[PDB]
Amino acid sequence: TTGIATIEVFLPPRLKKDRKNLLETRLHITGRELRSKIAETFGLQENYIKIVINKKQLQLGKTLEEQGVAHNVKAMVLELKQSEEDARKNF
């Protein structure tokens, strides 16, 4: 409805929150904005999270509709150790 999709996300058990939590956002935004806002909505650090959408890793550059997202889609938050650039820079 009205350009907003029902995105159900999953939280790791370390953050003892309601695993059946709901995130609401537009679809014109890209994965970069999506990744940032999930960290805020459930009290998480954005630098160390990976996101799984529509059974495929959340590509940050491409926008949501061109990613392949849809209504009533399921998501997950993946806790990260060492940043994506930090892990590459590590060795």
């Binding site: 790791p12 059946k20 495929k56 890793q57 993946l78 892990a87 060795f91």
Partner: protein, 745 residues
């Protein structure tokens, strides 16, 4: 009654007085009832006008037999005349448990089509008497997905349904419920085993064995008077700390250890990291990401395989593993694929999900796909669609097989293609003749290998003495290797079929002795694997002594295979006696790098999960067979027919197929709200209680423990007190306890 009584004893009773049958004596009707079945076989189709009084007697003989506790005789009357349909109408509350227990014990020896008929009839008694949890067990044995739906939704006791969802999750059978069903959320969580990691970790804290174990603590070299060595300890570290999430060697800064291995040694070492994180999809994926960006090709794909391990045995509502592995199944580098398909197979083994299979299918037909990944593709898609008879995976497996040239069929990575075909028809039985028809076109000796593998997998866990008749006929003709490649599967076939029940299984050991004696090297190179399959995670002394004698065999392959089987037989049992033999075997085989690698492998499997994990495919009192577990069991053991080139070679990652069979030996009593509820329980060796009436004890030589205890092979569990009423009579896995109203009256 005194003489033979052929068509006489029934005749005078049939024609004479038709009063109450028991008025002439219990011994008379017992004679009369037997003759009823005798002439029933003699009576043909045209003699249907002769059975009118015959049906009347059985409507009175059956009530008489159950009146004087002679119930096992009653079930016998309907079985011979093939009229077991009418038994359920006359079953009473005081004797429902005896008839089903008797009939269910009979389904392992009666052949088709009476297998299902006796199973459905026993199912009918449970359904009528509102014993849903045991009715679901019979449905699972029947592999009737529609019945599983009907059994699940018919129950209105959600507490029973919550406990039922555990059994489906333990078997790996997933059920897609409707949102209209009450308590939909927790029901999907219970069967998906998402809470398995936390529940498994809860026991580890309770059983104060959370501390990590270094392979040195397992080797114990201080009591003893290389790339392969480092790779061996990678498996030992993974096996011992499996599904724990903590380790002193890889959970710490493991780059020094991870790079200590070389060539494909780093492939399994990186993959071993996910085995410590087995069932921990959320926290486990948090640790692999560091090794996922490694520039070295082996580490990334080894991690890519470590993806599939971390979701293995767990079903996520949206899958993480497919996201991490979808874009690497068609990578140009063969190693990167190798960690993709094999990982993808373990993550969704026993799913029959179309999205992964369609993503995994074109890999097998890829031109750049080597035989190594092509066989891995067969192993994976066979594992996803195990026991489903999915024609789509079936079509390509044939399609790849006969397209290949005769020369490359000599390669032992092509042996995995029939295994994928066999796994896809695992346990179906009579559903392979159409497939066996297609296999005649394939050339020899692979056709001899191919048809044997699928035919064995068709009758897995069936006990069909007719099917094992032909396999020994293959074992009878000995070839003076190349022509006798299929001979190994034939020996492995006896284990796969006879494993269903105990009586069939230990006949196989006697035959397995002669094959190790009269058989050719290639014939006797597969007997230890059959021992491992027939008694996985069941460390009996007869097999272990048998495997010990051929540990130091003249034939090197029998030597490696026996040592692996010894650890495989005692997989996760933490046997103190068996570990001493391996430690002694380590000293003896210290100067043999090939033999010593199996020795270290067996020590890790012996201490798998620190004694809290099993690889046995049978749970629910060893009556219900897990298709996923055999798929990993078959994948490793069939690959061990070429231990020199696959295990000892560059494809030792196939040992991670055992993850699909890794499950906890669990007895956790949960409250109705699913919180832990520790109570006193009695754990002891299981006792057969068929026959003898009254109340016979089902456990002998038992001890009383708190519930969070580990049950190895062959021990049952009974509640010591009557304060709580279990939902399932089978006290295995996760069990929900209900407070007894009679208690504290």
């Amino acid at each position: 009654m005194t003489m033979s009584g052929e068509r006489e004893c029934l005749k005078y009773r049939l024609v004479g007085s038709q009063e109450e049958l028991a008025s002439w004596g219990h011994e008379y009707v017992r004679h009369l009832a037997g003759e009823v079945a005798k002439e029933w076989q003699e009576l043909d189709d045209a003699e249907k006008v002769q059975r009118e009084p015959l049906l009347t007697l059985v409507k009175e003989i059956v009530p008489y037999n159950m009146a004087h506790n002679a119930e096992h005789e009653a079930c016998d009357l309907l079985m011979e005349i093939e009229q077991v349909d009418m038994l359920e109408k006359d079953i009473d509350e005081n004797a429902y448990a005896k008839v089903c227990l008797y009939l269910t014990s009979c389904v392992n020896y009666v052949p088709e089509p009476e297998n299902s008929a006796l199973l459905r009839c026993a199912l009918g008694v449970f359904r009528k008497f509102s014993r849903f949890p045991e009715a679901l067990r019979l449905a699972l044995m029947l592999n009737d997905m529609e019945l599983v739906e009907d059994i699940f939704t018919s129950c209105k006791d959600v507490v029973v349904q919550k406990q039922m969802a555990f059994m489906l999750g333990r078997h790996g059978v997933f059920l897609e419920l409707s949102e209209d069903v009450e308590e939909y959320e927790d029901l999907t969580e219970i069967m998906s085993n998402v809470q398995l990691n936390s529940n498994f970790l809860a026991l580890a804290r309770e059983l104060d064995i959370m501390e990590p174990k270094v392979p040195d603590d397992i080797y114990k070299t201080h009591l003893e008077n290389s790339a392969r060595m480092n790779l061996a300890s990678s498996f030992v570290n993974g096996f011992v700390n499996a599904a724990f999430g903590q380790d002193k060697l890889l959970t710490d800064d493991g780059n020094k250890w991870l790079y200590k291995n070389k060539d494909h040694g780093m492939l399994s070492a990186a993959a071993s990291l996910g085995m410590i994180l087995l069932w921990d999809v959320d926290g486990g994926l948090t640790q692999i990401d560091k090794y996922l960006y490694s520039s070295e090709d082996y580490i990334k794909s080894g991690a890519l395989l470590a993806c599939g391990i971390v979701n293995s045995g767990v079903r996520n509502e949206c899958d993480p593993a497919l996201a991490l592995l979808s874009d690497y199944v068609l990578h140009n580098s063969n190693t990167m694929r190798l960690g993709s398909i094999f990982g993808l197979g373990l993550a969704y083994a026993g799913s029959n999900r179309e999205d992964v299979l369609t993503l995994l299918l074109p890999v097998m037909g890829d031109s750049k796909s080597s035989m190594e990944v092509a066989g891995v593709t067969a192993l994976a898609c066979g594992m996803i669609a195990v026991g489903s008879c999915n024609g789509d995976v079936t079509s390509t497996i044939l399609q790849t097989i006969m397209e290949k040239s005769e020369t490359e069929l000599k390669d032992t990575y092509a042996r995995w293609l029939p295994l994928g075909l066999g796994l896809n028809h695992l346990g179906k039985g009579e559903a392979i003749e159409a497939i066996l028809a297609a296999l005649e076109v394939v050339s020899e000796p692979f056709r001899s290998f191919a048809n044997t593998l699928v035919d064995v997998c068709a009758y897995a866990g069936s006990g069909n003495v007719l099917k094992v008749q032909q396999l020994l006929h293959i074992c009878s003709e000995h070839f003076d290797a190349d022509m006798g490649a299929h001979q190994g599967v034939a020996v492995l076939g006896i284990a796969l079929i006879a494993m269903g029940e105990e009586i069939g299984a230990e006949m196989a050991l006697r035959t397995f002795g002669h094959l190790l004696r009269y058989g050719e090297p290639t014939l006797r190179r597969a007997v230890p694997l059959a021992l491992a399959l027939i008694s996985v995670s069941n460390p009996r002394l007869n097999i272990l002594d048998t495997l010990s004698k051929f540990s130091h065999d003249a034939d090197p392959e029998v030597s490696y295979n026996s040592i692996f089987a010894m650890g495989m037989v005692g997989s996760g049992t933490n046997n103190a006696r068996l570990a001493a033999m391996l430690r002694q075997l380590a000293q003896y085989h210290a100067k043999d790098p090939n033999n010593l690698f199996m020795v270290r492998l067996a020590q890790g499997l012996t201490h798998l999960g620190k004694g809290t994990l099993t690889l046995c495919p049978y749970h629910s009192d060893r009556q219900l067979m897990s298709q996923v577990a055999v798929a990993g069991l078959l994948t490793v053991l069939v690959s061990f027919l070429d231990v020199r080139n696959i295990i000892l070679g560059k494809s030792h990652y196939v040992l991670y197929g055992l993850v699909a069979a890794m499950q906890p030996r669990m007895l956790v009593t949960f409250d109705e709200e699913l919180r832990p509820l520790p109570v006193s329980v009695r754990v002891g060796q299981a006792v057969d209680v068929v026959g003898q009436a009254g109340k016979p004890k089902t456990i002998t030589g038992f001890q009383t423990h708190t519930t969070p205890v580990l049950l190895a092979h062959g021990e049952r569990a009974e509640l010591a007190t009557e304060e709580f009423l279990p939902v399932t009579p089978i006290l295995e896995g996760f069990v929900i306890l209900r407070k007894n109203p009679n208690y504290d009256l």
